[PDB]
Design a protein around this ligand. Sequence first.
Ligand SMILES: [Cl-]
Length: 278
Amino acid sequence: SIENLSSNKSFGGWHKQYSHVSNTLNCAMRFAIYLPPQASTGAKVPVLYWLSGLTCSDENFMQKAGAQRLAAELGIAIVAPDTSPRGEGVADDEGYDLGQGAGFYVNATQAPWNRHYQMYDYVVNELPELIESMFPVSDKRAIAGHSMGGHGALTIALRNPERYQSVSAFSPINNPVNCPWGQKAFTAYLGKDTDTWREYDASLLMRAAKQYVPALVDQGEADNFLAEQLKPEVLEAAASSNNYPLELRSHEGYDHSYYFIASFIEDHLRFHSNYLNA
Ligand SMILES: [Cl-]
């Protein structure tokens, strides 16, 4: 029902990969965890959930973001789920932008996708329950992500404000109802009635937010997807309009890659630590 697949010592702590049978997705799922050195002492540690973007697995961030150094110092565990259901019986598309690697963190209502594409319930309900049951962790959590995963973090935090201390993102999809990535995925997973899409749009949620989760967003100015897919100005406008605690930082010359993420991940860890320690 749960299997440790791999272990690698990392900055006096541990990077470990698991597979488990998901009740919400009705499929096997892989996730990775980083436990800091403090978890070896008897301490319970807080958890940063990291959600990845299109095509990614539970490996990309663990390998490339360089988060382990500071997570170790600050005593933060990081949990990185995969980006979609995977395996036998799970629908898929040949394109990188739909199906596997592309769950969009929604609960799909349209067949065939509705059978397995319940990534919102997985991230919000099943995964944290599992993590808290297995690992030496507290009930204090935060959430972050990149692009589709930034969309994931923001939308989940805004709809579950009591559940998350803080939220952050790199290159988030802010207004997915108004971009091709969001439109393709939402039409396929949720159908043609865009009223059903509203609860999955960070910019729309933020404008209407009744309770604040502190937020930090970093955007590379040389990100090729900025205008068409990401639309940070649209998030800023929502924040402005709702007195929302959003710090949105634009960085000249930086792109959409993990090189950009690695460049500011320590900022994100110090930001989360501020709220996870409270
Ligand atoms: Cl993405």
